[PDB]
Design an enzyme around this catalytic site. Sequence first.
Site, PDB file in Angstrom:
ATOM      1  N   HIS A   1       0.725   1.333  -5.723  1.00 42.70           N
ATOM      2  CA  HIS A   1      -0.008   0.210  -6.536  1.00 42.70           C
ATOM      3  C   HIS A   1      -1.119   1.287  -6.321  1.00 42.70           C
ATOM      4  O   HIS A   1      -1.825   0.621  -7.622  1.00 42.70           O
ATOM      5  CB  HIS A   1      -0.635   0.818  -4.705  1.00 42.70           C
ATOM      6  CG  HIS A   1      -1.917  -0.704  -4.365  1.00 42.70           C
ATOM      7  ND1 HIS A   1      -2.362  -1.687  -5.158  1.00 42.70           N
ATOM      8  CD2 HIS A   1      -3.151  -0.801  -4.304  1.00 42.70           C
ATOM      9  CE1 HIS A   1      -3.756  -1.697  -4.948  1.00 42.70           C
ATOM     10  NE2 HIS A   1      -4.126  -0.798  -4.342  1.00 42.70           N
TER      11      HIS A   1
ATOM     12  N   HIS B   1       1.233  -1.198  -0.190  1.00 47.73           N
ATOM     13  CA  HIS B   1      -0.222  -0.174   0.237  1.00 47.73           C
ATOM     14  C   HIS B   1       0.653   1.370   0.262  1.00 47.73           C
ATOM     15  O   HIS B   1       0.789   2.145   0.902  1.00 47.73           O
ATOM     16  CB  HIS B   1      -1.037  -0.327   1.973  1.00 47.73           C
ATOM     17  CG  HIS B   1      -2.416  -0.817   0.870  1.00 47.73           C
ATOM     18  ND1 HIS B   1      -2.093  -1.845   1.585  1.00 47.73           N
ATOM     19  CD2 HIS B   1      -2.758  -0.795   0.294  1.00 47.73           C
ATOM     20  CE1 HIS B   1      -3.513  -2.561   1.509  1.00 47.73           C
ATOM     21  NE2 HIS B   1      -3.460  -2.023   0.500  1.00 47.73           N
TER      22      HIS B   1
ATOM     23  N   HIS C   1      -7.348   6.384  -2.872  1.00 43.72           N
ATOM     24  CA  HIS C   1      -7.856   5.489  -2.532  1.00 43.72           C
ATOM     25  C   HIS C   1      -7.423   4.691  -2.088  1.00 43.72           C
ATOM     26  O   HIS C   1      -8.077   4.270  -0.367  1.00 43.72           O
ATOM     27  CB  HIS C   1      -8.597   4.445  -3.447  1.00 43.72           C
ATOM     28  CG  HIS C   1      -7.268   2.944  -4.245  1.00 43.72           C
ATOM     29  ND1 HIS C   1      -6.127   3.811  -4.317  1.00 43.72           N
ATOM     30  CD2 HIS C   1      -8.286   2.410  -4.351  1.00 43.72           C
ATOM     31  CE1 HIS C   1      -6.223   2.751  -4.796  1.00 43.72           C
ATOM     32  NE2 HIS C   1      -6.893   1.222  -4.601  1.00 43.72           N
ATOM     33  N   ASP C   2      -6.121   4.935  -1.549  1.00 41.90           N
ATOM     34  CA  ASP C   2      -5.359   4.466  -0.120  1.00 41.90           C
ATOM     35  C   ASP C   2      -4.285   5.227   0.119  1.00 41.90           C
ATOM     36  O   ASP C   2      -3.457   4.952   1.050  1.00 41.90           O
ATOM     37  CB  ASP C   2      -4.374   3.267   0.156  1.00 41.90           C
ATOM     38  CG  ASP C   2      -5.606   1.792  -1.054  1.00 41.90           C
ATOM     39  OD1 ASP C   2      -6.620   2.575   0.157  1.00 41.90           O
ATOM     40  OD2 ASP C   2      -5.094   1.124  -1.886  1.00 41.90           O
TER      41      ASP C   2
ATOM     42  N   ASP D   1      -8.697  -2.058  -8.377  1.00 49.23           N
ATOM     43  CA  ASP D   1      -8.316  -2.436  -6.992  1.00 49.23           C
ATOM     44  C   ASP D   1      -7.216  -3.515  -7.322  1.00 49.23           C
ATOM     45  O   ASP D   1      -6.519  -4.017  -7.318  1.00 49.23           O
ATOM     46  CB  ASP D   1      -8.822  -2.158  -5.703  1.00 49.23           C
ATOM     47  CG  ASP D   1      -8.397  -1.595  -4.105  1.00 49.23           C
ATOM     48  OD1 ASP D   1      -7.235  -1.014  -4.643  1.00 49.23           O
ATOM     49  OD2 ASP D   1      -8.786  -1.911  -3.592  1.00 49.23           O
TER      50      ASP D   1
END
Length: 338
Positions: free
Chosen positions: A79, A75, A115-116, A245
């Site tokens: 990614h 992460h 998103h992360d 994802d």
Amino acid sequence: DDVPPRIARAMENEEYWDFDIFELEAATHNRPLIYLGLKMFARFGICEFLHCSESTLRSWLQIIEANYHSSNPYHNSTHSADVLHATAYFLSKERIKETLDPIDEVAALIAATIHDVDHPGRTNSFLCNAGSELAILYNDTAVLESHHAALAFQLTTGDDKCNIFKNMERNDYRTLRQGIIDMVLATEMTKHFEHVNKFVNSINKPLATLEENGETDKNQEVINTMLRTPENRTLIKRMLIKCADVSNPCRPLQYCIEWAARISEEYFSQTDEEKQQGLPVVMPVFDRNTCSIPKSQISFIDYFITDMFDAWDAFVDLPDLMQHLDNNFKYWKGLDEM
Ligand SMILES: CC(C)Oc1cc(Cn2cnc3c(N)nc(Cl)nc32)cc(OCC(F)F)c1
Ligand SMILES: [Mg+2]
Ligand SMILES: [Zn+2]
């Protein structure tokens, strides 16, 4: 623009599925998201839609990529660059062009980027049991997923130079904000089967029914009318961000294995920390001292990936991804050798 040569060569065949993301990671010195972001935003023409300059986009991509933790194996910025590449690939397909609007394409590519953001290499369950600052802040409900979207908008709109939504209308930004938030929240694990079943029941099964009556213009317009509704466009967005994802099992074999090592290493570090501090072991199978990575990936693919990408394949038509999925699945089986 004036990009270095190795990074320019690393982003040579970015439209294709077979793409060396780790060469781009190595070339950019753990800055793959800014270079790939500038190209992908320029290709779709996102700053032309949002009415931002190139300097605003560079500052936006830097501050977000900075908040991605380099210490995390999986992460990190690389990614989200791979997830941005997966998103851009699905948007480029004909089914998604015909169905989704330009506002959804902008919402999809921005969502994948953020998103992360500020992922601590640790799951929701870890932070809830540990009693983390974010777990208390978000009340054990989408602890990471809410923090990713929230922090992204804090970093974007909070600073003037970073704000890429500054010249938008009141109505346009409100729709785009709700679009991105929904797609970022859709990546949470516990809603997997909710978001997968909704895609099957509301899109694929009706579309399978409508295909029985030939390929007429009257029936094709009904297919166009049914898919393009706001509710169904949301369900496709939720499915697309979910598939983008976890696209790593449908990548080429070399890249698939590298993603499997990083996610596994990340879960082994959590399990070691859970035993040390005395936290309840939520992921017992993912321990470095007992975990079979080949067997774990087979379990991972069977449970989540196989049915999801099967549904996503029927809609979009992705023969390359499913061919890679079969090739990678057979490889993990072959590594037993006993
Ligand atoms: C229990 C745990 C392994 O479940 C997960 C983990 C993840 C995260 N994740 C992303 N790529 C992964 C991979 N190659 N292997 C494993 Cl083991 N987990 C991965 C996503 C997911 O589902 C997809 C979506 F729901 F998030 C479900
Ligand atoms: Mg996530
Ligand atoms: Zn992610």
